[PDB]
Amino acid sequence: SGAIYVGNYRVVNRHLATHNDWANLVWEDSSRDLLVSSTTAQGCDTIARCDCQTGVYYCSSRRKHYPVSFSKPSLIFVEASEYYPARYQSHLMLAVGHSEPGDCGGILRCQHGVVGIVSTGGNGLVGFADVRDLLWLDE
Numbered sequence: 001s002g003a004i005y006v007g008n009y010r011v012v013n014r015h016l017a018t019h020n021d022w023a024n025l026v027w028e029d030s031s032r033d034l035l036v037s038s039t040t041a042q043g044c045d046t047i048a049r050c051d052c053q054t055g056v057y058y059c060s061s062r063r064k065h066y067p068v069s070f071s072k073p074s075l076i077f078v079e080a081s082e083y084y085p086a087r088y089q090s091h092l093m094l095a096v097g098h099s100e101p102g103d104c105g106g107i108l109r110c111q112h113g114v115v116g117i118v119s120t121g122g123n124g125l126v127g128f129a130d131v132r133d134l135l136w137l138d139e
């Protein structure tokens, strides 16, 4: 679990969005596993606007933050799970690192701010849904 709080927006994994999130929807994209809902109070997370490929992510299944190198946002095949059929997920970045189902929502950050959140994993890999292209989160 986990979310990004920027301005009057809450960014979560679409597959983990609560009933309150759908009742206050701003934008969602199943192909990116992202959902943005509106908030009453202002959030303090700063979104990164960069092309960094190194950062630190939070891994709830280890209660630890790990430094990682990660790929550029890409269209990547994700096998069928309990949340989606087999499909290509867009804007996804992979890194070599531990992740389990329960770790989705963990933040990935670089020196410029929030880069994305854990969205996929398996086989000693961890994948993050990029948010650096969503310029509108800043306004």
Ligand SMILES: CSc1cccc2c1N(C(=O)N1CCC[C@H](C(N)=O)C1)CCCO2
Pocket (backbone or CB within 6 Å): 015, 033, 078, 081, 082, 083, 084, 089, 099, 100, 101, 102, 103, 104, 118, 119, 120, 121, 122, 123
């Ligand atoms: C951090 S998720 C994870 C981590 C390790 C092993 C894993 C996972 N699972 C996932 O990758 N998914 C479940 C949640 C939604 C994902 C998506 N964006 O399509 C897919 C479950 C199946 C494969 O097994």
Ligand SMILES: [Zn+2]
Pocket (backbone or CB within 6 Å): 048, 049, 050, 051, 052, 110, 111, 112, 113
């Ligand atoms: Zn950066």
